[PDB]
Amino acid sequence: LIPPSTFLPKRDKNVPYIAEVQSIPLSPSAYSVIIKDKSIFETSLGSVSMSSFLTSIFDSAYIASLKYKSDDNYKYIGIPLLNAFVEWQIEEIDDSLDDKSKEIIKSYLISKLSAKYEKTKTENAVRVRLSICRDLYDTLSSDDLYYENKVYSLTLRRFLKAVYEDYALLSDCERERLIFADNIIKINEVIKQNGSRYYSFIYAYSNMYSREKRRIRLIPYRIVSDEYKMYNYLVCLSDEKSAGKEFKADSYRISRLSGLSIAEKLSQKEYSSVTEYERLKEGHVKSVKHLLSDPRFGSDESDISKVYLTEKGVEMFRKILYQRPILKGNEKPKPNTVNEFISPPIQVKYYFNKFGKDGVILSPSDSFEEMRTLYVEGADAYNREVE
Amino acid sequence: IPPSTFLPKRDKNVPYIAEVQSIPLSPSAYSVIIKDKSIFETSLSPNGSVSMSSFLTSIFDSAYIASLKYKSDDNYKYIGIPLLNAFVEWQIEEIDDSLDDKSKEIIKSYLISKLSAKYENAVRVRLSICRDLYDTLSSDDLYYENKVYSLTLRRFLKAVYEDYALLSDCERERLIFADNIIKINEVIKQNGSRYYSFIYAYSNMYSREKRRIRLIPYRIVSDEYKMYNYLVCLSDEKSAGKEFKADSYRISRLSGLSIAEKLSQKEYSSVTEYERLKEGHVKSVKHLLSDPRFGSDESDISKVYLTEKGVEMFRKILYQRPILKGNEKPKPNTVNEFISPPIQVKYYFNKFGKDGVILSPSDSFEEMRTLYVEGADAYNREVEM
């Protein structure tokens, strides 16, 4: 006769909280994506419990939805907006519409999201046991999930299944931004404070260029994905490469930063190394621009690699775009000749390692010697299976 | 007046010349489409090819007809064909028919305006427009697409192929094999609950050469990996023509699908009692609906020997990394079974050398052996004075 409003009832805060367990039935495919992401995250950061990992995903996705039209939504730039969260999808409705039109659109959205996450699937579901911590309990019992309560008809099981099934469908780089949301939020705060003036740096811990964590100074510029949606990078100025002495453009995997500090202002000597007339110097701008377009390999150095391409090699070069290196002045490669690549030698090697005789890396000597070893030992392995 | 359609109506009295449209695709979309094309081609006769234009045209034709026919009398034909966000007609027709006209017009305007805003270092893909695609792109049957993409063909086609590339493997496979799916759906509708009729089909499923079998379709389902779609059916293959038994066929390994013929009364009485599927067939079919692949699909497993170093490289190199059997962790210094397409295993382990040796299938082994043996000879030759 009178329905509850929230997924879970408000708890007596006077009584100690005891964590209740919710069983979430996940598709084998969603479970296996979450297992993979969890053991990859752990290598950053041991062990994290499945509950903690599922809670991080929920917390990140939720705060981006809740704060979508917030005054401080600059904090959540790049945090994915999951289809399972509904607040953002209501707030996205054209603000210029009359109230009656918005109510009709709101009902159209609630009904279509209900139908989508209410479709019974034929599957062998994996029972995933989420322990609900006090902070998650208070979120799931709050009034701040109004539209989710309506879409999922007050059924926590349905809501959480939808969150984790949607998580599992995101690209690698999207899933990574949910997992490392806390790094992204602190970076977004500093980018806003700094604008174009780059008054301030943050301290951060990096194992990007070291086995042990180094405390370095970063001047953030922009977070980007590679073009294949694999990894997120902070393009920035860093003092790592000169070991504290001066700031140079670089690109850090967001997964290899931790323990980010509040922004502190640079000293006038240091501010004058970075900026002139309160703008990033031409040299920093140029280097940053190179890293925005290639945030994996832009960070390495422009040395010559000599590669002999056959006719077949040029045809393979034309068809295989993944991490494909460039010639001088972005020329087309020439068949049956030595071609000069100016991309970092490591990227040339990662491209032509699958070409064998159709893409023979002649130099530098390093690349020649690694390819010769890979191929001679590989050949011996394949021949061993025949004889 | 001013243009109404993506392309103007052509004078049909003039011989047709295919004009080429340059479509700027994200590197990620292009890489998904060239992989799909290579994998589709492995369904054809040994050395067989499709042009990029033909492959992109098939994707467009499948996605389009599912959108156009979403509410039609014969929409039974398109059950399971993905409805791309790039196509708009279905999204207008999906509006709850029970709403008053004013509410529907408000939702229609909300959808047109929001889809306009959403689809407003590319790989330039040169799509040759065949006569039938030209006549579609110049028809009035893209009313809402013309509004959403402001009459700009480049924008519409980019949206189609970017959305294609975002689908799961099994969704993309259902657009590519739509013609098989449509013929299967026709027979599912005709049969309903009575299963009166079978179709003949050719299977690459359980033979090296195409085998002519009889199928009673039940339902198309995806495996637990969202990799391949299976027709769950009854089939006469296992008893070699003698009787119908529950089975599962990759829709990618069915071809030459015939008209439905009615079963003979001896055969109909093996399959049904009182015009309903016998409990035994129901029970076997139910196991295959929840897992259509496990312990029926043995066909194109890749055997790869990984060293300790191989396992470390497997852990670190995620790009197009193939799926193990049951999604197990790979094991060092032993043969590992990969259930990803043989092409994807080969594109992953071609850079592993002795740390990732593809032992089977025979084709993969012989290509890798040739790549490595001829590669070694090329690198060794450069050390000779």
Residue numbers in the entry:
A (entry chain B): 2 to 46, 50 to 391
B (entry chain A): 3 to 122, 128 to 392
Question: Can I see the authors' text?
Answer:
The Type VI-D CRISPR-Cas system employs an RNA-guided RNase Cas13d with minimal targeting constraints to combat viral infections. The Ruminococcus sp. WYL1 (RspWYL1) has been demonstrated to significantly boost Cas13d’s target selectivity and RNase activity (both the cis- and trans-cleavage). Through structural and biophysical approaches, we reveal that the full-length RspWYL1 possesses a novel three-domain architecture and preferentially binds ssRNA with high affinity. Specifically, the N-terminus of RspWYL1 harbors a ribbon-helix-helix motif reminiscent of transcriptional regulators; the central WYL domain of RspWYL1 displays a Sm-like β-barrel fold; and the C-terminal domain of RspWYL1 primarily contributes to the dimerization of RspWYL1 and may regulate the RspWYL1 function via a large conformational change.
To gain mechanistic insights into the modulatory role of WYL1 in the newly discovered Type VI-D CRISPR-Cas system, we determined the crystal structure of the full-length WYL1 protein from Ruminococcus sp. (RspWYL1) by the single-wavelength anomalous dispersion (SAD) method. Each asymmetric unit in the crystal structure contains two RspWYL1 molecules, forming a diamond-shaped, ∼95 × 85 × 80 Å homodimer. The RspWYL1 protomer comprises three domains, which are arranged in a triangular fashion. The two protomers in the RspWYL1 dimer spatially arrange side-by-side, and interact with each other mainly through their NTD and CTD domains. On the other hand, the CTD−CTD interactions involve 16 residues to generate an interface area of ∼1300 Å2, accounting for the majority of intermolecular interactions of the RspWYL1 homodimer (∼60%). The NTD of RspWYL1 harbors two RHH motifs, denoted RHH1 and RHH2. However, the two RHH motifs of RspWYL1 are in a single polypeptide chain and fold together in a pseudo-2-fold symmetry, highlighting the diversity of the RHH superfamily. Instead, an unexpected charged residue (Arg133) is present at the position 4 that would cause steric clashes with the major groove of dsDNA, implying that RspWYL1 might disfavor dsDNA. Our structural analysis revealed that the WYL domain projects out from the dimerization interface of the RspWYL1 homodimer, and adopts a Sm-like β-barrel structure. Within the RspWYL1 homodimer, the relative orientations of the two CTDs differ significantly.
